[PDB]
Amino acid sequence: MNMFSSLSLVTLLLLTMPIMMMSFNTYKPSNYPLYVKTAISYAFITSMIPTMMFIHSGQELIISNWHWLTIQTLKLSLSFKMDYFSMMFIPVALFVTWSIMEFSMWYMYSDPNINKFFKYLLLFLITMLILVTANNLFQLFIGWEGVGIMSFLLIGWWYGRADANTAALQAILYNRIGDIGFILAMAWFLTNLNTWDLQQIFMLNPSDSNMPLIGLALAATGKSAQFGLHPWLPSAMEGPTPVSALLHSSTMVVAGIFLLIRFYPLTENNKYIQSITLCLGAITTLFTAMCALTQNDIKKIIAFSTSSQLGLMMVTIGINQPYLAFLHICTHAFFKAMLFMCSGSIIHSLNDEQDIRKMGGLFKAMPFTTTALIVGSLALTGMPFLTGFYSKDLIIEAANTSYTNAWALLMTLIATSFTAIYSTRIIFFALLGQPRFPTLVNINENNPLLINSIKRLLIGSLFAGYIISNNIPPTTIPQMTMPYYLKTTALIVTILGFILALEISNMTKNLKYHYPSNAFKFSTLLGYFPTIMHRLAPYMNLSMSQKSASSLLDLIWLEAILPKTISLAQMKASTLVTNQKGLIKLYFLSFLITILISMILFNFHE
Amino acid sequence: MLKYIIPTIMLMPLTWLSKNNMIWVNSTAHSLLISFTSLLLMNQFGDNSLNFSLLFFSDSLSTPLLILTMWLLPLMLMASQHHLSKENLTRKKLFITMLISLQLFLIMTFTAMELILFYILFEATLVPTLIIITRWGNQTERLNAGLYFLFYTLAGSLPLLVALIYIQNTVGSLNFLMLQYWVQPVHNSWSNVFMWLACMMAFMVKMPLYGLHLWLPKAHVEAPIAGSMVLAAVLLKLGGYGMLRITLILNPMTDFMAYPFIMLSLWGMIMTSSICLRQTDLKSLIAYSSVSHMALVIVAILIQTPWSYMGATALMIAHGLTSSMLFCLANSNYERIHSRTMILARGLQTLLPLMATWWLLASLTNLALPPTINLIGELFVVMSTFSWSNITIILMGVNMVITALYSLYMLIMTQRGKYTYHINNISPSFTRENALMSLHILPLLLLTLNPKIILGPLY
Amino acid sequence: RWQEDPEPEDENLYEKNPDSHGYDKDPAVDIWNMRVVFFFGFSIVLVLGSTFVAYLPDYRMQEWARREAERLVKYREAHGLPIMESNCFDPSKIQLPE
């Protein structure tokens, strides 16, 4: 308890020390990026000790060290839940962040603000670890919005670029809409359970949890970028590639799914929530994978893959398998961060070229990047016994053996096939064929920072899934009996995707011109959702803001009905009173009228 | 309270007897020492307020407001001394005198134990504020702004005076301690409907209430920087403080009299947040932000629950430091480009890096980023309003979305993008300006560590 | 028209005093103004004032209440009494209407 509790806090304290040094001018800014990277590597080592203790005996504890505030009967303490989800996510997140940070030393070498970049990456990580170990909802909210703000700051890294500022504000906007559900859940739990603590919520176990869980789902819809609040994640590609790798594997996008996992004691009993998340996940995974089929920006293809993988996780929540969903978070972190670092390696070597149509012939020119890309692609598609297979395969065969929506199951299976198609697109168009890039060749992947960072995540994309699966305790009843055609479904549809993708890819080399189909434009333009919503909604809101709220009401009608009317009457009355002829005859004639009406009408004389 | 009233008065002889080149140094140094001793007011008890004499008392509601008031006077002096540099020496001393006299009326207003004494001091703040706006504002419209400020307040204050005197005639006392024990319920009648309105309309105009807010965009924009700092930070809180006290004697009639004003606020904040999205004047944008935030305070005071009173108290303190910092930030730009137009100077983060950090920190506190006390207050109010009616989560949630959009829109438009080519007098930020920014944000962020001292009497 | 002075030119404090702190034109007054703001603002009010607040003696007696509650819970559970009764005031001292 003393070592477990002590070591699980140094990890969090260790990560803040570079922040304290920077903010307190006590550092040698010579190689601050190396300092930050070194601290992350040491945090990973210290985080393994608590995890090994959990692996050994399932030891878990809650630390409520600091009493912050008591609001009548709601005591709020700084608390950390060191449980199954915390003890496995933290070492994975640190290990992936260790590679991303070493990679970013090479990738952001030329940046004049690289020191600030590494500080922001570290804050991004600290806010995610606050989120993942939070024991009460208020502490969770701190990390929930912390990653949201760091995301805003990093996506808009190149702040001279109008597109980077639009994309950054878009991320805040979509995540703030999701945060309405978070605030809703907090208010319901406080009102109905008198707690924001996760322990009291589960002990009381509310039966009518429709409203709190709908709020939690809405929060997850925004953070995890599910259909409806999805467009911001592809737009987040405006950021430097290291941001995309970290924002897509760890940190932001996984927080939405993690929030629903943390509340599985509630959702596991509420069928109506399971149906909603299942259908929300199924439309997301299908729709975004469909979008990736025709993208030409390499970062956007990988970005839409993350959206489709997060949709798959929501489906797993929707079929009451929170632990499989968590496993997919952990395995996904490895090969998705590797894929982004591989694309960054290609983009850097081709002078910031991101269109796959201007790549080609890089299979032999960039051998190590090629190997990592193929390993990352095979892991993504569920190649047997790579890291991806140990989560994705169990999810698919747990979904076709469940009591489940048939459309959601069928849509999920098609998305698995689409996963093999857009994966083949990247390999075919980036690596194969003849080079299509400019004539001054500058390819070079020989920096040790680049090689070592990818090499560690390559070892992770091969064995990490096998290691984790064989060390985590069982918490369900794995359903291992099924017909052959349900067992091998994921494997088969994946193979069909590769074959169909290859034929489609090879037909681009024929000398035939074909007019675009309606479905091709629908996929390419993202179902027209950003084209319509991001013009219509801003226009209606912004026009109302000016025409009605500001002009009609504030500058006219609220002026007209009070100050302008009152003051106009006073002016008119003044002119009536003071416009007189100065004639003695008229004033004294008015005296006689006053005396008469004073007696005849008002009887002032009686 | 004489240990704060007397030294605050002694600031006036200090300023008038100073050497001509030390008026700012001396007044700023000694107003900071007064600010230091104000921390002795935090000797608060769980059950009893701190009752000094027959005239003045302090409780957990007035104590944080007093500490904010005495802290702002030093900050208003530093903010002012640049644009008054060319001013005639005696007119500089008079300007400082108005600020000191405003502080004197404020610290007595927040501690007066009798409501009619509160009324007289509540009203006495009009005079120095009006003089500051009209004498030392820059534009032609400052004269009209003073008139709107004066008559919007007085139109509500005069009915309050009649109501208070009527309450004293019938109850026999206006001492607030007595009113806690001698209070009787208010039964329905047209007579009591108008007693309620006369007791609440003066405070609603000061907040301001949506519909009665037109004076504030004019006054908060035409005023000199010091005038805007006090108007936003403190004077708006006389309305909130007054409501928090007088609602004691209005029950249970507040049950149904609150409905028209809760509706004006819930819808008002969404209307005034949306206005900020299309504002062309940076100071005007900030002013309309204050209306949106103070709408929550009005709702929290009216629904009258233990959580909403804690949230209202936190919001009033947090808004005071944030809104004051934003006006000061916008003033620093204005002192360089001599225009309030927001789109005029862009990409300023490229030319003024550190000052862009203050812009970010000010913006984050404005959009209520947790665990800032801005979020703490705004969250407590949302928790209690949800219980009042669950559907209010929709309006609170929408306002939180819109507030982030205009908070970051102001940050993006002024600090990011490309710098305006023809603006070539953006000198580096002065030490005075950097210190003035950090004296808002640092205390604001420190209070997160110990938020119980700004949660009011119901903590 | 009329006889009026033209608008005076803008004065950049850094041209005469590159080390300007932005307080005063006089370099000696300018340094003193910065000193009082920093010492009395940061060193005194913020640092000592924060220390004062942290060591406030049991602000609003929340710590005494926790100690008192523990004493009551211990006494009530030992003697078999209810932890908390629904009635705040003893009903023998109350005379209901009707």
Partner: peptide, 19 residues
């Protein structure tokens, strides 16, 4: 700029027989 002060046009608002 500098602080606005009333000019002749403004001042003649108050120079007539009536307001």
């Amino acid at each position: 700029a500098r602080q606005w002060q009333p000019d002749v046009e403004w001042a003649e608002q108050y120079g007539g027989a009536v307001m």
